[PDB]
């Protein structure tokens, strides 16, 4: 796991500074190591002398140098892939939703974005034997569409204590774009204590369409969104959780591309495009991925969560 | 209920600023808490120093952090679901029109959109025992089709003082899209005093087809509609009312999809598609919902409001 920031005091850092760091969002040694010198300067009780000391000491505790692809292929083969509750869909993702990375699921309305996030919020607690993550879930919701009764329906499918599953889902309703980012700083604190295995922001860009209106606020909208997506990438490296954000769509009138622009297209590693099939069937499609080939699968929304096409 | 904004003075806010906030639409502590820092800056007599103070103080009065799905499933099980006056239809909605959320009812002409809104405007005053909301109704009407004689016909069915029911319906006729949004700021004031349990905008998108003509005004049309739908979502969180908007349709000539585009498809949580059945029967259909399964029911328009198929 990640080393807590308290281990910096044992290396020659004033316990007052650690408190000044922990008031800035940093809670692990990694979070301070990965941080630039610029960020630590922006802290009040920190100067360029301290920041150079903090960065130097923290760098000794976490590897930040070169290795070999062999040593990386080894460490990567032991990465957790959470099942989506669909044999047909996991065969598309070659295992399931991959941890330590940002995954994006966009599509028109009803295409099952929120439904996949509810299934993931349950199956991330199964033992790894059964294809899960053996951890809690963190469901940031910017729409008011978090339904606990949909988590119970999936727990019944996998035979889990519905009362116990709802204890492992830390729910938080974001009301604007500033609050949505504030919830991530509090999120970095919780993941140090417990063991969360899945972070869900649905929808990640819902509140950016309205808080930032026209083109006059376009530049500020993407720069604020870029910091959010960057702060998610930091959580994926600090704790090795799985970040699964959902995205809305927009028509092109010159036939539905996702919003967020190039800021969210480059940041996310895996993009899933969900269409409407027939009846209760849907069609997921590897829109972008570093490793997976471009292909389509057909899942469906059933009364017990996301599952294979029951037909 | 929601805390009135006057409780900010007791926490170290200049009573002049509260007056400068209440002149900007904010009337509850929630409305200021949920608001972004950007909105408060846009106020004249407010600076970044004050806004940071206002947001900090208000955040202490209302929970804006994480909880558990268990604590949320508990708080959600006590939510009010207003009956639609049809046993067959409520069994489709698993209770009735759910408060604290935006519900959309679209369909061709005559399909009973305005008729459901008239039944809802009455049954929202029944005691919760009988399946209502025990509150007033607020009927914003952008078409001129609000008929009080249809409210009396429903009051006779449920045995209510027709003179008393018409005292609990705050009617307002919107004449353009700017006026339609202005009515929501005045709406947030009234809901602080009385106890409204249902907000109705019918039709929510009627005036957007004509005020914004061709494609040249398409971008401005949806951004103006997005702020409206966002301002409704704020009322659903401030006061926990039930927002029931109706939507017109449009043919696809490439066979009737609703207007509003993706802006209104993502914003609304529940969408009801109303067809024409036979004679006086109609067919509602769960077009989109986070929890309800895709299914169809058959109601009818009777001389005493919306009711089951009297056949």
């Amino acid at each position: 796991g990640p080393q807590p920031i308290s281990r910096l005091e044992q290396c020659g850092i004033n316990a007052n500074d650690v408190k000044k760091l922990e008031e800035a969002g940093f809670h692990t040694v990694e979070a301070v190591a990965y941080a630039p010198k610029k960020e630590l300067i922006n802290i009040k009780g920190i100067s360029e002398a301290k920041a150079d000391k903090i960065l130097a000491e923290a760098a000794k505790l976490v590897p930040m140098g070169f290795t070999t692809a062999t040593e990386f292929h080894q460490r990567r083969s032991e990465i957790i892939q959470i099942t989506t509750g669909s044999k047909e869909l996991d065969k598309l993702l070659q295992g399931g939703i991959e941890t330590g990375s940002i995954t994006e699921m966009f599509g028109e309305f009803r295409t099952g974005k929120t439904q996949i996030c509810h299934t993931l919020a349950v199956t991330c607690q199964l033992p790894i034997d059964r294809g899960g993550g053996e951890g809690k879930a963190m469901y940031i919701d910017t729409e008011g569409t978090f339904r606990p009764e949909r988590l119970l329906a999936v727990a019944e499918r996998y035979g889990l204590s519905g009362s116990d599953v709802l204890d492992n889902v830390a729910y938080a309703r974001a009301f604007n774009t500033d609050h949505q980012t504030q919830l991530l700083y509090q999120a970095s604190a919780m993941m140090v204590e417990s063991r969360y295995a899945l972070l869900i922001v649905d929808s990640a860009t819902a509140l950016y369409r309205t808080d930032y209106s026209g083109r006059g606020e376009l530049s500020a909208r993407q720069m604020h969104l870029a910091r959010f997506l960057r702060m998610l990438l930091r959580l994926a490296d600090e704790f090795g959780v799985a970040v699964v954000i959902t995205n809305q769509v927009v028509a092109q009138v010159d036939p539905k591309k996702p919003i967020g622009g190039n800021i969210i297209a480059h940041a996310s590693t895996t993009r899933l495009y969900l269409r409407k099939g027939r009846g209760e069937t849907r069609i997921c499609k590897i829109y972008d991925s570093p490793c997976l080939p471009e292909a389509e699968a057909m899942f469906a929304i059933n009364a017990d969560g996301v599952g294979d096409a029951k037909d | 209920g929601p805390q009135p904004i006057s409780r900010l003075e007791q926490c170290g806010i200049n009573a002049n600023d509260v007056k400068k906030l209440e002149e900007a639409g904010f009337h509850t502590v929630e409305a200021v808490a949920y608001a972004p820092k950007k909105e408060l800056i846009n106020i004249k007599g407010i600076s970044e120093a004050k806004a940071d103070k206002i947001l900090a103080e208000a955040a202490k009065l209302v929970p804006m952090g994480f909880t558990t799905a268990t604590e949320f499933h508990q708080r959600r099980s006590e939510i009010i679901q207003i009956t639609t006056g049809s046993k067959e239809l409520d069994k489709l909605l698993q209770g009735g029109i759910e408060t604290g959320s935006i519900t959309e009812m679209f369909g061709e002409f005559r399909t009973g959109k305005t008729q459901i809104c008239h039944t809802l405007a009455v049954t929202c005053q029944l005691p919760i025992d009988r399946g209502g909301g025990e509150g007033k109704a607020m009927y914003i009407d952008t078409e001129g089709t609000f008929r009080p004689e249809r409210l009396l016909a429903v009051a006779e069915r449920y045995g209510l003082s027709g003179s008393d029911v018409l005292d609990n319906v705050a009617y307002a006729r919107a004449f353009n899209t700017d006026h339609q949004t202005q009515l929501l700021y005045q709406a947030s004031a009234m809901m602080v005093e009385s106890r409204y349990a249902l907000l109705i905008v019918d039709s929510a998108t009627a005036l957007y087809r004509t005020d914004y003509s061709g494609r040249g005004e398409l971008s401005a049309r949806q951004m103006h509609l997005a702020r409206f739908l966002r301002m409704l979502l704020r009322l659903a969180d401030e006061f926990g009312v039930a927002v029931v908007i109706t939507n017109q349709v449009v043919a696809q000539v490439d066979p009737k999809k609703p207007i509003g585009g993706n802006i209104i498809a993502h914003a609304s949580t529940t969408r009801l598609y109303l067809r024409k059945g036979r004679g006086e029967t109609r067919i509602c259909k769960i077009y989109d919902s986070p929890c309800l399964p895709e299914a169809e029911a058959m109601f009818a328009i009777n001389a005493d409001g919306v009711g089951d198929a009297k056949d």
């Binding site: 199964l126 053996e134 727990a155 019944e156 204590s161 116990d164 | 952090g65 604590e71």
Partner: peptide
């Protein structure tokens, strides 16, 4: 803040 139950550590979901 943090809920009195969100601060609780993970629990292996018992079967049913």
């Amino acid at each position: 803040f943090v809920s009195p139950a969100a601060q609780k550590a993970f629990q292996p979901p018992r079967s049913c």
